[PDB]
Amino acid sequence: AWPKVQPEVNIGVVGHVDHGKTTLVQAITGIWTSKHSEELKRGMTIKLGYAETNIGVCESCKKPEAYVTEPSCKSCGSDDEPKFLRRISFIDAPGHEVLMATMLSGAALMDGAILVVAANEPFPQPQTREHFVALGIIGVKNLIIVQNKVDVVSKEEALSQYRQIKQFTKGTWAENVPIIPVSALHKINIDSLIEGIEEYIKTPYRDLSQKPVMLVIRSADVNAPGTQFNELKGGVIGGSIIQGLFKVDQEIKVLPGLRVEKQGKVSYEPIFTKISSIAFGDEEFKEAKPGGLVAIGTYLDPSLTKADNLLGSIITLADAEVPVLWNIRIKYNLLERVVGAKEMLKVDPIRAKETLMLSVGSSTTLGIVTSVKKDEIEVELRRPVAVWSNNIRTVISRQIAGRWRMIGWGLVEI
Ligand SMILES: Nc1nc2c(ncn2[C@@H]2O[C@H](COP(=O)(O)OP(=O)(O)O)[C@@H](O)[C@H]2O)c(=O)[nH]1
Ligand SMILES: [Mg+2]
Ligand SMILES: [Mg+2]
Ligand code: NA
Ligand code: NA
Ligand code: NA
Ligand code: NA
């Protein structure tokens, strides 16, 4: 039979609102992650979506139909058992223009991505561009472009759009990114997509000797219906491990941690705890490695792990030396244009005293620019950040026309 292992790779699903991201994740995994009525009432799904699947190959059948997402070869007309390849997970990022920050949060977890482009809409829509550029900046360059909703357009329309997309990727880092036509709704040509995922989004090399670091996704910020969060022994903290590994019974800390407030003075103090259990999907494990949304059981009271006063952005081993900073220095670069805006806009230079939004790991923090000199800024953060490394790229956003727009990026210098 097929093994039960944790997912070994995270694949983002990005693109403009209503282009078919959640439907595509369903076509691949069988799982619809969002709540239909909530989406109806709000006109959007604000949480990240998360789902998993095993991937196999029927070695007798021919490709792409030989690829399967369950232990059967019936889809390619064979009674043989498919060979297990790997388990993968998807991170369904919101496409709505008011939700870039959430997308950026999700993007911190991606090892690769699928950009979903609706065939029946003008390419490229504002969040098509914004998400594409964000992926570029962050370094999620193992990309597949999917032309979705091919069932509603003619061959000529699809061809025309294809030419637009080729023209778009031409002369960029994505010049050789494949473009795969599908219908997510009708599950048309999904096997070619799986084939593409195996070809273009290889599981990255993981150096398990690195210090363990996990980026935290608060439970209120994610729809992960398939992942067990058992509070029997205490609060469960979900997220994704970006380096090293964690093990049951290990001592860990949540950083920046708990908001304290002693005599007008405000600080965030680390929350130490211990791993009581580790879960992926509906299975328990002795250890957890990068890839997948892991559920780390602790011995903490759930009232703490769910608290607004807990700034839980990362988890590390208890021994880890991690600066927690209220004021940071960033060596930045600005985009030329506000790529996510409807109007054609140049991004203005960074000005002292302006408010910026900083995406660091899975966290989002507003800050005031105290100093701007050359290609470095100093910013006083509304809440501190935990800087677990010297090589950390933050994404910079600015409020424009009542929405937060990505305008650039930088290195957090410590
Ligand atoms: N005709 C057609 N409709 C689709 C397809 N994929 C998604 N849709 C529809 O388009 C709408 C947007 O899909 P959704 O996955 O919610 O887009 P998201 O906002 O990017 O997650 C939904 O009503 C889907 O039923 C497709 O391949 N063909
Ligand atoms: Mg959706
Ligand atoms: Mg139909
Ligand atoms: Na599956
Ligand atoms: Na198949
Ligand atoms: Na990544
Ligand atoms: Na068609």
What CATH number should be reported for the domain holding residue 305?
Answer: 2.40.30.10
Examine the domain organization and report whether 19 and 152 are in the same domain. yes
| Domain of residue 140, CATH code | 3.40.50.300
Q: Which residues pair with 191 in a beta bridge?
A: none
Cis omega before residue 270 (within 30°)?
no
- Which residue bears the tokens 């880092």? 173
Query: In terms of domains, do 37 and 87 share one?
Result: yes
Residue 53 tokens, joined: 């699947």
CA distances from 249 to 207, 236, 275, 277, 287 (A): 22, 14, 5, 8, 10
Domain that holds residue 53: 1-206
Where among 278, 298, 321 does a domain terminate? Answer: 321
Residues ≥6 apart with Cβ < 8 Å to 94: 17, 44, 45, 46, 47, 48, 102, 103
Handedness of CA 307, 312, 317, 323 (dihedral sign): negative
Question: SS3 for 285?
Answer: coil
Contact between 53 and 46 (Cβ < 8 Å): no
Ion ligand 7 nearby residues (CB, 5 A): 150
Q: Are residues 95 and 176 in the same domain?
A: yes
Rounded Cα distance, 201 and 287, in Å: 24
195 shares its domain with 213: no
Among candidate residues 190, 39, 104, the one with its CA nearest the CA of residue 407: 104
Q: Do the Cβ atoms of 130 and 100 come closer than 8 Å?
A: yes
The resolution, in Å, is: 2.3
Atom 14 of ligand 1, nearest CA residue: 20
* Residues 331 and 295 placed together within one structural domain of the fold: no
Of 276, 204, 196, the C-alpha closest to 241 is 204
CA of 184 from ligand 3 middle (Å) equals: 10
The answer to the question of whether 18 is labelled as a binding residue is yes
Return d(Cα 152, Cα 120) in angstroms, integer. Answer: 7
- Count CB atoms within 10 A of the CB of residue 320: 17
* Residue 65 in contact with ligand 1 by CB distance below 6 A: no
Q: Do residues 115 and 253 both lie within one domain?
A: no
| 75/146 Cα distance (integer angstroms) | 22
Give the single-character DSSP code of 209. Answer: T
Are 147 and 12 part of one and the same domain?
A: yes
Element (H, E) at 6: none
CA-CA distance, 171 to 116, in Å (whole number)?
20
* Residues 105/364, Cβ–Cβ less than 8 Å: yes
Ligand closest to Cα of 25 equals 1
* Distance from residue 30's CA to the centre of ligand 5 (Å): 14
Task: Give me the number of domains the chain comprises.
Answer: 3
Domain boundary among 175, 190, 206: 206
Closest ligand 1 atom, residue 182 Cα:
27
Q: Are residues 230 and 335 in the same domain?
A: no
348 DSSP 8-state letter:
P
Indicate whether 194 and 215 sit together in one domain.
Answer: no
The answer to whether residues 302 and 361 belong to one domain is no
This entry's atomic model was obtained through X-ray
* Cβ 146 under 6 angstroms from ligand 1: no
What's the rounded Cα separation, in Å, for the pair 406 and 173?
19
Atom of ligand 1 nearest to the CA of 152: 1
Whether residues 77 and 212 share a domain: the answer is no
| Bridge partner list, 372 | 377
Q: Is 267 annotated as a binding residue?
A: no
User: Which one-letter DSSP state was computed for residue 76?
Assistant: G
Q: Is 149 in the pocket of ligand 1 (CB under 6 A)?
A: yes
Pocket of ligand 1 contains residue 18 by CB under 6 Å: yes
Q: How far apart are CA 112 and CA 114, in angstroms?
A: 7
Total residues found in the chain within this entry: 414
**Last residue in a domain, options 180, 206, 232:** 206
Q: Does one domain contain both 11 and 53?
A: yes
Residue to mutate (ligand 1; options 13, 23, 188; most atoms within 8 A of CB): 23
Spatial distance between the Cα atoms of 292 and 12, rounded to a whole number of angstroms:
11
Nearest ligand to the C-alpha of residue 72?
Answer: 5
